[PDB]
Design a protein around this ligand. Structure first.
Ligand SMILES: Nc1ccc(/N=N/c2ccc(S(N)(=O)=O)cc2)cc1
Ligand SMILES: [K+]
Ligand SMILES: [K+]
Ligand SMILES: [Zn+2]
Length: 257
């Protein structure tokens, strides 16, 4: 029954998930001055031309846009990655107010929200086997700030009314995640974890430096979602972010000078 509240939120997770206090937990604060440019990083390749979305789901902690990952399509490679990683889902974390909501921070700055595009390493055959591996996953993280609308986000916004409550899902085909990407692929990268239980330490994080802008109206619609199920007392789905965790024995690398 983990969640984001007082009695079940991030400070409680370690009881059921002791890895919460592990050596490579996420998210982290990205100290931009300490991050070092890495000339060993290969160009990052985001190839989403053939991405095939299937469905959108309110899982009671966020909403997931799911992809058919049965064929080699929507792939992430290059950068810090060895081999090819396949897109399985994306989701967001966001705040109750524009001043908070991101999981990663940049010199302690919190963005209004953060998009996570989740990929599994194809060497491991599927997502379930990949999460048993230290290099099983790559998550592409993208910050959201409130300003101009993101036109490519609107289709997601408009379907949220149909998945208000935990356990609701809806068909969501033909969504193009290319419409969610900023111009620049400049990034920071480090080894980390899932940011929700089970908090598994499988993730190569790739966090883009350039945020996307979304409108106040768009993020307000995220905030109308519910953590609770249909017929249950309303608890708005807001502040579904884990705070920054200790960096410990890690270096953050920059893809740019
Ligand atoms: N058994 C199991 C259950 C839930 C799992 N969740 N997958 C996740 C995928 C991505 C993230 S995140 N917020 O992108 O780090 C967090 C969790 C993964 C494995
Ligand atoms: K609450
Ligand atoms: K949940
Ligand atoms: Zn996430």
């Amino acid at each position: 029954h983990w969640g984001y509240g007082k009695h079940n939120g991030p400070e409680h997770w370690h009881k059921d998930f002791p890895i919460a206090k592990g050596e490579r937990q996420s998210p982290v604060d990205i100290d931009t001055h300490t991050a070092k440019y890495d000339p060993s990083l290969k160009p990052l390749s985001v190839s989403y031309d053939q991405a095939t979305s299937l469905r959108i789901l309110n899982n009671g902690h966020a909403f997931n846009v799911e992809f058919d990952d049965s064929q080699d399509k929507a792939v992430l490679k290059g950068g810090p990655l060895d081999g090819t990683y396949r897109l399985i889902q994306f989701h967001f974390h966001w705040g109750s107010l524009d001043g908070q909501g991101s999981e990663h921070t940049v010199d302690k700055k919190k963005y209004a929200a953060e998009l996570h595009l989740v990929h599994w390493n194809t060497k491991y055959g599927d997502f379930g086997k990949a999460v048993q591996q230290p290099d099983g996953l790559a998550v592409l993280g993208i910050f959201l700030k409130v300003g101009s609308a993101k036109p490519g986000l609107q289709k997601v916004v408009d379907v949220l009314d149909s998945i208000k409550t935990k356990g609701k899902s809806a068909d969501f085909t033909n969504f193009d995640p290319r419409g969610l990407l900023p111009e620049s692929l400049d990034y920071w990268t480090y080894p980390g974890s899932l940011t929700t239980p089970p908090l598994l330490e499988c993730v190569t994080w790739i966090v883009l430096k350039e945020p996307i802008s979304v409108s106040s109206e768009q993020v307000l619609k995220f905030r109308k979602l519910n953590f609770n199920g249909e017929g249950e007392p309303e608890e708005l789905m807001v502040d579904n972010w884990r705070p920054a965790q200790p960096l410990k024995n890690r270096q953050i690398k920059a893809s740019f000078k």
